[PDB]
Every structure is written in C-alpha cells, then in structure tokens.
Amino acid sequence: ENKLGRDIPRKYANQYGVFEELAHIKSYKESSRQVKPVKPSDDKLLSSIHEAIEKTRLKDGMTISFHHHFREGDYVMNMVLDEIAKMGIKDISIAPSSIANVHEPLIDHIKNGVVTNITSSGLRDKVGAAISEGIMENPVIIRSHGGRARAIATDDIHIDVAFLGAPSSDAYGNANGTRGKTTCGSLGYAMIDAKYADQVVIVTDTLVPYPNTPISIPQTDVDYIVVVDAIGDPEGIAKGATRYTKNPKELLIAEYAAKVITSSPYYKEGFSFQTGTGGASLAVTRFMREQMIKDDIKANFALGGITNAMVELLEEGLVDKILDVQDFDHPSAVSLDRNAEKHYEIDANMYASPLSKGSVINQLDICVLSALEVDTNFNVNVMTGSDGVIRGASGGHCDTAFAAKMSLVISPLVRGRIPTFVDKVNTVITPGTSVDVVVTEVGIAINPNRPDLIEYFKDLKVPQLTIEELKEKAYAIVGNPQPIQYGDKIVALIEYRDGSLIDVVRNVLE
Amino acid sequence: ENKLGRDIPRKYANQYGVFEELAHIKSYKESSRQVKPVKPSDDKLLSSIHEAIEKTRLKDGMTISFHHHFREGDYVMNMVLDEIAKMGIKDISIAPSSIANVHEPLIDHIKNGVVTNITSSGLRDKVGAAISEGIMENPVIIRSHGGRARAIATDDIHIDVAFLGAPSSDAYGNANGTRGKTTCGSLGYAMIDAKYADQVVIVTDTLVPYPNTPISIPQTDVDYIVVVDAIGDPEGIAKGATRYTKNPKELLIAEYAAKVITSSPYYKEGFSFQTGTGGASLAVTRFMREQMIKDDIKANFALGGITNAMVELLEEGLVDKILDVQDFDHPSAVSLDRNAEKHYEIDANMYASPLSKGSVINQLDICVLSALEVDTNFNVNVMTGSDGVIRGASGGHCDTAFAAKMSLVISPLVRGRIPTFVDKVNTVITPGTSVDVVVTEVGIAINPNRPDLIEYFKDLKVPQLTIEELKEKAYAIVGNPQPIQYGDKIVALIEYRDGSLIDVVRNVLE
C-alpha cells in the first residue's frame, strides 16, 4: 500500500501521484487559452442555446464546464447538455464546479454516451447514486475547489467551452451575479472558468443595456451571450436566510467549538475565520459573537460560503471585511452588493488554490468543518455515506483544513444508527494531518500532531479525550457497523488538492 | 514603402508588417506566464527595492515594465532603474506604459548601457529629446495603449518583472489606486502588466491590513510587495481639477466641435463619447452639456482619461456610467471610489485592444481628439513637433479614432509660427482613414471618405471646407515651414495598433 491505509490500485497510483504527507511545489507555466478575436461589427448575442453550441464549434471528445452557484435551482446544466444530446454530440467531457440533485437528467446522458467523463466537487444523492452503481465506464474525477482551480491553471485539464449562467449581462458579455430576476450573488467558481476556457458562453436570464456593472465576468472573457426565459428556479434563491439550529446536542457541539476558538492562541484583535453553512458548524458563530462582544476584540475578515449570520456580523461591526466565493442564501447575495468593498467577491483560485501566488485561506486563522466520518487517524470523509454510496462533496474541506492555522472538525458522536467516529473511513477526502481539533458532544479531541495545542488548552474547561476514545464511545452506542458489499470497479478517483491521489471509491453492489 | 507615403526602410518594413489600410484578424494563443507558487508560510513582503530585484532573479537582457498613472509625479521608475544600475545589471529592456519628463534619469541609464530597448506610448520632452539625437543604438518601439495591450497578450513581447506602483496594498498583494497618501485613481495600464507578467513586484506607499479593498490588482498576480517612504510626489496628484479654457479661439473650436456632435446621426438618447483632457478638446463638453440639457437626451457612458468635467456630468445625471482607464486629476480619481459602479475601472486591454473579445471603444459613438499636425490626407501626427524632435505620445489616439463611429480631430489653424495643417506630416500616428471630421476656428473639414457625413451635415450651419483649403489657409498665415535637417539613423519605429509599421522617426541634426 501507500502512505495511509488506502487500497489504491497501481494502475491509478502510477497514473497519478501516489501519495498525499504533503509535498513541495515548483514553478509552472500557467494555462493559456485560444482566443477568437472579435471584429468591430461582430454580434456576440445569439438566439438560443442551440446556436451557441453551433457557433461554438463543439465537437465530440471536447470538454465543457458549468458552475453551481444556483445550486438545486440550476437550469443551465440540464439545458445545455440536453441540447448537446439532441444534436447527436457525444463523448463529451464534463467539468462542472459541482453537481446537484436537480442535475438528475445527467444520468441518462451518461447511459447514452453523451457524457463520458466527469470532474467536480460533488455529485450529491441522485447523480452520485448512479455513479456508485457503475453507470459510467470511466471514473469520476473528484477535486476540491482549490484542486479544480489548480488543475485548470496548471493546464493538466483544459476547457473547450464554458457555459456559464449569469443573472445579468449586456449584449457584449459583462455579467454579474447580483443583478437580475434570478441572482445568486458571488460567481467565484464561474470566474475562473471564463478566465481559462477557450470559448465562453454566458446564458443570462435578464439582458441589461451596455455597459453592465458591477462586472464579475468582463466582456473580454466572453464569446457569446444567449438570453433565455429562466436560468434558475425563481424562489430557488429568492427565499430568505437560514436561522441557527435548535437541536440541543448540536448547540452544545457548537458551544464547545467556540470555546476552543476563543481560547486558542489565535483569538485576538484582527483574527480571521470561516464557519459552516448550517448545523453546529454554523451555530458556532452565535457563541463566538457573544464572546467577541464580552471582550472588545474584532475579527479582520470572514471567508467561504457566506450566510446571513456572516452579514449580521459585518453590520454589527464585529468583522471588518468579508471575502465571498459563494453565497448560501439570498440575503448574503444581497449583501455582496449592499455593503460593497466590505463584502468582496473572489474567484475560486484566489480562494483556495495550492499553486498560486497566494490564496485567502492562507490567511485564515481558524476554520470550522463538519464530517460524515473520521477515523482514529484523524482522516475525514465527506464523500461517501454509511452505505458506501457517494453522496457528499469535497468542497474546500481539505483545502482550508490545510491552510488554516487551526482546523476544527465538529460533528455529533453518532447519527441515528451510524457512528461518526470509526477505525477507518470508507473514503478519505481530508488527511488527519490537516485536522487539529475534533469537537463532539462528549468533548474535544486534540490531534497529538499538535503538541503546542495540547499544552495551550491544558486548562481549557472542556472534556478532552483521544480520538480512539471517541470511537469506542461511539461503538458503545450503535455497535460495530455492518460492513458494506463493494465491487471491483473504481467508480471514481479522489484527487488531493495538490494533484495526487489520496484515495478511490468503488461501486456498491446492487 | 507603406500604404501611405512613408519611406520606411525595407529592413524594418520586412521585419514588421509593412502597411497600415487596415487588415484582418485571426485566432491566436494568448500569452501565458511562468508562475512561482507560494508556500503557505512564504512572506511576500520585502524590505527594499534592492531585495525585490534580488529575489526576483532579474538578469541581463530581461524585460521589465512600469505604469504611468502617477505621471510627472512618478518615483517608482527612477527608483527601480537606479537600483538596477547600482547593482551592475545592464542590457535591460524597458516596457513602461508611457514615459514622462520626471523620468529624465533614464537618459544616463541609456548612455551607460543599463537600458538598451524601450517601448511605450510616449517619451515627452526630455527623454524624447535625447532619443531624437541618437542616444540609443536600438530604435524605441512606440505602440498605442491598445497596441501595447495587444502585444503583451499576443506574446510577441513578454514581461519578466513588472514593478508597479500602488498607493495602497496589503502584505499579500491586493492593491488599488484609490486609497493611500498618494492615490492616482484607476490602474488600467498597470492591471494588464500584473496579469501577463511573469513576476510582479508592487511598490506601495502605504501598507494596509489584510485584506485590502477595493482590489484592482489581486494577490494572485503579485509576487512581492515593498514599502517605501513615497512612490509619488505629494501634491503631484493631491491638487485639484483643471477648469475649462478661456482662450476665445479654443472656445470657438470647442463650440464648433460640439455642434458637429450634436448634429450628427449619433446624437440621441443613450449615446457614448470621449472628450479631451484639456484645451478645446476638453471644453467641447461644456457646449455639449448645454445642448444635452436643452434637449432631454442622456448619454449612456463616457470613456478615456476622466476629468472633473466628466464627474460633473455623471452627478448631474447627464451620463449614466463612466468607464475609466486613467484619471487626469485628483477629483476624478476620487470619484472612481465615491460613485462606485457608476464610475468603473477598466484595464487597458478591455479599453482599446484591437485583438480581444471586445473593447469598450468599440461601443464609442464619438471621440474628440487633438493634434500637432494633420496633412491633406487626413493623417494625424501626435509624436513629433515642428523641429522634428520627438516629444509627443501615441496614447489611444489611433485607437479610438478607429473604433469610434465618428472621429473628430480639432485643433487651431496655427500655433505661433507653426502651421497645424500641412501637405505631409513628419510622423504618422493615426491614418486619415480613421479621421472623419476635422474642426478648426475657420470651420469644419469632412473627410470625403465619409460621404454619409457630408450629406447629413449639408445644412449644418458651420463653415465647411476641404482639408486642402485648411492647409492653404494655414500657409497664408505663417508661410511655408522651413524644412528640418534629419539624419540617417532610425531613432524609433511607430507600430500601428494592429502590430504593423505605419511610419518611422529619424534623428534630428543640430
């Protein structure tokens, strides 16, 4: 085997870098695109997605991309792909920033050979279920948000045509995600596509007179613009904010998490942080705020997927600035426009790329992450569930977990009949060497790899245990989990942020 | 020779494309840079310009760049170069967006072989004088703002290290030109450098805590940051706005110019325009405003180098938006921040590049330009003066002149003893085929190349003549100009926006 207790077949271990103790990085030639100059009399606006595919010269075997800022309300993905299928185009390589459940139509396109390769952060329930049963012949390549940005910039992947949805755009390409009848706020994942892709087709829901502003994607990165009745589901982003949890167990976990942060050697005036987008990982901000108020300390900035709780803090003057790569509710998207400058939009590359001139997460003091599983080696799994079926997402988990000065992975000891702590995770997305402190409702588990933290928290008034004790404490609740029946087909490869393979995922026998 | 009547030697006519009727454009591979990944523990802040040059690995023969947003108040250029000389580095290729008079120190660096090649928009009085007497062995390559952007993107030129001045920046590279003790507003010329250069060193005057915002240059484009006592002259940009002219002759020219615009088939609700930064070309906005008020027409946007007059219109609600590539006074730079979104910053490429997916000047309905000379073929000279000595600048002249629906070149019939209209210009920067209407104090001269304009203005109540009549009308004032004594050395090559040679400049003998 390799570094960790992973069974990665030599076929892939040799194809990709076989490892994931972190290594070194050296200079590289950034990817360059094939630009098609526009004549002063050329019209970049098109009538339909059809003509877009046409005038774009899309052929078999090419690679196309999409973003997931509209999440479950997305219409662009199913829209383009379907037209590609109808036009008899096949063997297309898909490179979406991430895949949601509304993207179910993808399954048939796979079965019929329209899509032959997929790469993204996650696949979620439906698409992931299919992929887990062996639908595709080739393995789905999963990359973290930073990994995707790294790959595109390193050119070890190249987008032929990027179909990007934009809630607003002029007839020349200037687009943004904060204006229109179907906004989504930031466009950080799409911004990188339009920057490295050869041809960019933005699909807008609302056409604005030239010049459109603000500008998240400049006319200089766009080739064609197509207007449609709707790019995303109306209320699918026009709803409201998601309040904190009420579950006492989660609130306790959140509170313990905040005590770890506010007692850490990083909690002081001008400290940075990133919290979750729901559950206990999100609630932690409530207790954190309280402690920040008791003291007169103020944080310099907040990152990640912003939520209303984050906007709340920016307005109360508790956090000076806020860097946004993705919004998780209408109010946060609104804030990106309302509190300009103080709430800034950033592309995924500036966000979490391991091979850049510098990422924001590199200035992050602490992050609060969640998990599906976590073994006695501190490895975290956010891809596969108990049944071994893919349904998660890599996101920026292994990304920030590494950059952050102190990584917190909080999660209930057990979920129903499924233990959150085990001796070995089914799939590895984030190496234990990146996890500093684990928080549960039973206490805190400090990674012995961080002796400086064990001492600093020595007197911390919170129950402390070993990761092994958490596992035993879990097994004593739902008993040893019943092993799953895995096949021999490699359903997908998990590429670590640095580009090497950290693990793999096999099919689940029917 | 060339299309026009320029005696461009075969040596250069063959080296570069020999022509300048406009041609066609085809797909190209955009330039890519050699990125040096930053380790999460790497510090990008340096102590001095010296260490910057050092850690940047600058060697002989490399190419470096600078921007001219600080104009005559710049300190960065002389700063870096001088340290390069002190360190014994030579045969350096200079690629500044433009050269001012304060850049006099350059002369000695040329004589001592420190700088062996130069490319930019202009050289102005001092540097230009030197170059005109044969100081450099190689010819200075002059390119329009668009040409420079085109060259850098086409990679037929490549920046090794870009030393950019920024009035504000964090210790990671996020910089802007609207915050700091020495602001300059927009950073459109520098923004392209940091995007295509291999290594970028920003020199700030004021260090701001991370993350800095707004962000004109992202941390992902910067390699090192160096803090100095001053990057630019204090009042050299902290002064005020420049009011209109008082010279009756100029005011008449301005007025005639406005009547041409307001009577053109482009004057209607939502029309775009760009006016000068001084003289009659600027004053034209006064009369224009009046006419726009009489009618209830409103312009969609204003472009170019913004002046307070422009901000004035944006506030009176007469112009909806304003795209800024360079500010020409403190108030305009201030407005770029004050009236956010409505006053937007744009990089030189998005501005006037002939080889892009689309430039703003391509949406420009009318532009008002000035000139040193203009022959009976409508060719315009903004490089050399009467004495044939270089002292001008290409700027965006030939750029917008071409993109604009209607190009106006206004200028007094004569300046002192020098005629503005002649039979042949010493140097050609903008081809007559791009000049539509010429405005003087004696009347208007419509280029016969625009028969649609001759008819539309048939009844325009303004004296109309032929370009030949303007010349004769000029010769009858200061007589035929006494020919200059030119040498045989090609002091510089003038590269047209498309990349080919339109003319050349020879040395002047005392």
Pair B301, B436 in one domain? yes
Which chain B residues contact residue A346 at CB under 8 A?
Answer: 218
Closest residue to B32, CB basis, from A25, A31, A323: A31
CA-closest candidate to residue B176, choices B323, B324, B337, B304: B337
What 8-state DSSP symbol labels residue B384? B
Residue B317 tokens, joined: 């609600």
Instruction: Tell me which of A179, A220, A361, A367 to substitute to probe the interface with B (most B C-beta atoms closer than 10 Å).
Output: A220
Determine the residue type at B223: D
Pair A141, A221 in one domain? yes
Residue A52 tokens, joined: 């877009």
Q: Please give the C-alpha separations between residue B466 and each of A440, B254, B316, in angstroms, as whole numbers.
A: 87, 19, 38
Determine the residue type at B178: T
Which chain B residues contact residue A35 at CB under 8 A?
Answer: 27-30, 153, 355-357
Closest residue to B173, CB basis, from A36, A215, A357: A357
d(CA B141, CA A20): 50
Q: Are B83 and B56 in contact (CB under 8 A)?
A: no
CB pair distance less than 8 Å for B30 and A33? yes
Cis peptide before A234 (omega within 30 of 0): no
Q: Are A94 and A85 in contact (CB under 8 A)?
A: no
CA B264 to mean position of chain CA atoms: 26
How far off is chain A from B195, nearest CA to CA, in Å?
A: 11
CA-closest candidate to residue B445, choices B247, B250, B257: B257
Q: In the beta sheet, which residues pair with residue A118? A: A94
Which chain A residues contact residue B321 at CB under 8 A?
Answer: 211, 213
Q: In the beta sheet, which residues pair with residue B384? A: B390
Q: Are B204 and B180 in contact (CB under 8 A)?
A: yes
Determine the residue type at A458: K
Total residues belonging to chain B: 510
What 8-state DSSP symbol labels residue B456? H
Which chain B residues contact residue A350 at CB under 8 A?
Answer: 218-220
Q: What is the 3-state secondary structure (H, E, C) of B253-321?
A: HHHHHHHHHHCCCCCCCCCEEECCCCHHHHHHHHHHHHHHHHCCCCEEEECCEECHHHHHHHHCCCEEE
Q: Please give the C-alpha separations between residue A230 and each of A169, B105, B134, B461, in angstroms, as whole numbers.
A: 14, 60, 64, 51
Q: Are B412 and B384 in contact (CB under 8 A)?
A: no
Q: Are B445 and B462 in contact (CB under 8 A)?
A: no
Which chain B residues contact residue A36 at CB under 8 A?
Answer: 27, 357
In the numeric block, the tokens 């840079």 are attached to B33
Pair A219, A258 in one domain? no
Apex CA B57: angle with CA B51 and CA B59, to 5°?
A: 115
How far off is chain B from A254, nearest CA to CA, in Å?
A: 27
Pair B58, B101 in one domain? yes
Q: Which residue of A has its CA nearest to B41?
A: A362
Alpha helices in B218-265 (DSSP H): 235-238, 248-262
Q: Residues 6 or more apart from A243 whose CB is under 8 A from it?
A: none
How far off is chain B from A210, nearest CA to CA, in Å?
A: 8
Q: Please give the C-alpha separations between residue B363 and each of A209, A216, B19, B61, B266, in angstroms, as whole numbers.
A: 12, 20, 26, 40, 12
Tell the burial category of B176 from Cβ atoms under 10 Å away from its Cβ (0-12, 13-18, 19+). Answer: buried
Closest residue to B26, CB basis, from A26, A37, A342: A37
How far off is chain B from A162, nearest CA to CA, in Å?
A: 15
Which chain B residues contact residue A212 at CB under 8 A?
Answer: none
d(CA B208, CA B214): 12
Determine the residue type at B235: E
Which chain A residues contact residue B341 at CB under 8 A?
Answer: 213-214, 340
Instruction: Tell me which of A174, A201, A357, A365 to substitute to probe the interface with B (most B C-beta atoms closer than 10 Å).
Output: A357
The sign of the CA dihedral B69, B74, B75, B77 is positive
Residue B479: count other Cβ atoms within 10 Å of its Cβ.
Answer: 10
Q: At what angle do helices A188-196 and A145-154 cross, to 10 degrees?
A: 10
CB pair distance less than 8 Å for B215 and A344? yes
CB pair distance less than 8 Å for B32 and A32? yes
Task: Characterize the bridge pairing of strands A437-439 and A444-446.
Answer: antiparallel
When divided into structural domains, chain A yields a total of 2
CA-closest candidate to residue B274, choices B450, B456, B401: B401
What 8-state DSSP symbol labels residue B212? P
Residue B294: count other Cβ atoms within 10 Å of its Cβ.
Answer: 9
Q: Are A455 and A478 in contact (CB under 8 A)?
A: no
Q: Which residues does a chain break follow in chain B (C to N more than 2.5 Å)?
A: 20
Q: Are B335 and B323 in contact (CB under 8 A)?
A: no
CA-closest candidate to residue A357, choices B31, B218, B63: B218
Sheet holding A272-274, edge to edge: A343-345, A319-324, A299-302, A272-274, A366-369, A406-410, A437-439, A444-446, A464-465
Phi-psi region of B40 (alpha: psi -120 to 50; beta: other; left: phi over 0): alpha
How far off is chain B from A194, nearest CA to CA, in Å?
A: 12
Q: Are B195 and B221 in contact (CB under 8 A)?
A: yes
CB pair distance less than 8 Å for A220 and B173? no
CB pair distance less than 8 Å for B321 and A221? no
Q: Which residue of A has its CA nearest to B201?
A: A357
The DSSP line for A426-448 is: SS-SB-GGG--EEE-SS-EEE-T
Range of the domain at B301: 240-484
Q: Are A125 and A476 in contact (CB under 8 A)?
A: no
Pair A357, A211 in one domain? no
d(CA A427, CA A451): 27
What 8-state DSSP symbol labels residue A304? S
Task: Characterize the bridge pairing of strands B199-204 and B224-227.
Answer: parallel
CB pair distance less than 8 Å for A213 and B341? yes
Pair B394, B429 in one domain? yes
Closest residue to A358, CB basis, from B172, B214, B321: B172
Tell the burial category of A211 from Cβ atoms under 10 Å away from its Cβ (0-12, 13-18, 19+). Answer: buried
Map residue A458 onto helix, strand or coil: coil
Beta strands in A148-239 (DSSP E): 161-166, 168-169, 175-176, 199-204, 224-227
d(CA A444, CA A465): 6
Closest residue to A323, CB basis, from B25, B30, B211: B211
d(CA B199, CA A444): 44
Q: Which residue of A has its CA nearest to B208?
A: A300
CB pair distance less than 8 Å for A222 and B32? no
CA-closest candidate to residue A252, choices A84, A439, A403: A439
How far off is chain A from B55, nearest CA to CA, in Å?
A: 14
Q: Are B200 and B190 in contact (CB under 8 A)?
A: no
Q: Are A177 and A232 in contact (CB under 8 A)?
A: no
Phi-psi region of A279 (alpha: psi -120 to 50; beta: other; left: phi over 0): left
Residue A465 tokens, joined: 């245990």
Map residue B154 onto helix, strand or coil: helix
Q: Are B388 and B508 in contact (CB under 8 A)?
A: yes
d(CA B394, CA B120): 8
How far off is chain B from A481, nearest CA to CA, in Å?
A: 39
CB pair distance less than 8 Å for B35 and A357? yes
d(CA B326, CA B305): 5
Q: Are B77 and B255 in contact (CB under 8 A)?
A: no
Residue A451 tokens, joined: 């002796």
d(CA A190, CA B144): 32
Termini Cα distance of chain B: 27
d(CA A17, CA A150): 15
Which chain A residues contact residue B152 at CB under 8 A?
Answer: none
CB pair distance less than 8 Å for A215 and B31? no
CB pair distance less than 8 Å for A32 and B30? yes
Which chain B residues contact residue A25 at CB under 8 A?
Answer: 37, 39
Residue A182: count other Cβ atoms within 10 Å of its Cβ.
Answer: 23
Pair B229, B301 in one domain? no
How far off is chain B from A113, nearest CA to CA, in Å?
A: 31
Closest residue to B38, CB basis, from A349, A356, A402: A356
Q: Which helix (H) or strand (E) holds A82?
A: helix A76-86
Residue A299 tokens, joined: 């944080």
Tell the burial category of A112 from Cβ atoms under 10 Å away from its Cβ (0-12, 13-18, 19+). Answer: exposed
CATH of the domain at A55: 3.40.1080.10
Q: Which helix (H) or strand (E) holds B20?
A: none
CB pair distance less than 8 Å for A35 and B27? yes
Determine the residue type at B205: D
Pair A433, A505 in one domain? no
Pair B438, B493 in one domain? no
Which chain B residues contact residue A433 at CB under 8 A?
Answer: none
Cis peptide before A9 (omega within 30 of 0): no
Map residue B15 onto helix, strand or coil: helix
How far off is chain B from A418, nearest CA to CA, in Å?
A: 36
d(CA B333, CA B325): 11
Q: Which residue of B has its CA nearest to A34?
A: B29
Closest residue to B403, CB basis, from A40, A355, A360: A40
Pair A280, A411 in one domain? yes
CA A102 to mean position of chain CA atoms: 17
Which chain A residues contact residue B32 at CB under 8 A?
Answer: 29-32
d(CA A220, CA A416): 52
Q: Which residue of A has its CA nearest to B349?
A: A220
How far off is chain B from A225, nearest CA to CA, in Å?
A: 12
Q: Please give the C-alpha separations between residue A278 and each of A246, A283, A313, B8, B9, in angstroms, as whole numbers.
A: 12, 7, 16, 70, 71
The DSSP line for B74-130 is: B-HHHHHHHHHHHTT--SEEEEES---GGGTTHHHHHHTTSEEEEEESB-HHHHHHH
Q: Are A152 and A31 in contact (CB under 8 A)?
A: yes
Query: What is the longest distance spanned by two Cα atoms in chain B?
Result: 73
Determine the residue type at A334: V
d(CA B312, CA A1): 71
Residue B113 tokens, joined: 């072989």
Pair B214, B342 in one domain? no
How far off is chain A from B401, nearest CA to CA, in Å?
A: 13
Residue B248: count other Cβ atoms within 10 Å of its Cβ.
Answer: 9
A·B CB contacts under 8 A: 154
Tell the burial category of A425 from Cβ atoms under 10 Å away from its Cβ (0-12, 13-18, 19+). Answer: buried
Determine the residue type at B204: T
Residue B238: count other Cβ atoms within 10 Å of its Cβ.
Answer: 14
Which chain B residues contact residue A28 at CB under 8 A?
Answer: 34-35, 37
Q: Are B392 and B382 in contact (CB under 8 A)?
A: yes
CB pair distance less than 8 Å for A30 and B25? no
What 8-state DSSP symbol labels residue B162? E
Total residues belonging to chain A: 510
Beta strands in B325-381 (DSSP E): 326-327, 343-345, 366-369, 373-374, 380-381
Residue A502: count other Cβ atoms within 10 Å of its Cβ.
Answer: 27
d(CA A162, CA A143): 18
Pair B244, B211 in one domain? no
Counts for chain A of helices (H) and strands (E), in that order: 16, 29
How far off is chain B from A196, nearest CA to CA, in Å?
A: 10
What 8-state DSSP symbol labels residue B453? H
Q: What is the CA radius of gyration of chain A?
A: 22
Q: Are B287 and B258 in contact (CB under 8 A)?
A: yes
CB pair distance less than 8 Å for A356 and B270? no
Instruction: Tell me which of B29, B220, B339, B365 to substitute to probe the interface with A (most A C-beta atoms closer than 10 Å).
Output: B220
d(CA B280, CA A472): 85
Q: Are B278 and B242 in contact (CB under 8 A)?
A: yes
Residue B477 tokens, joined: 């004032």
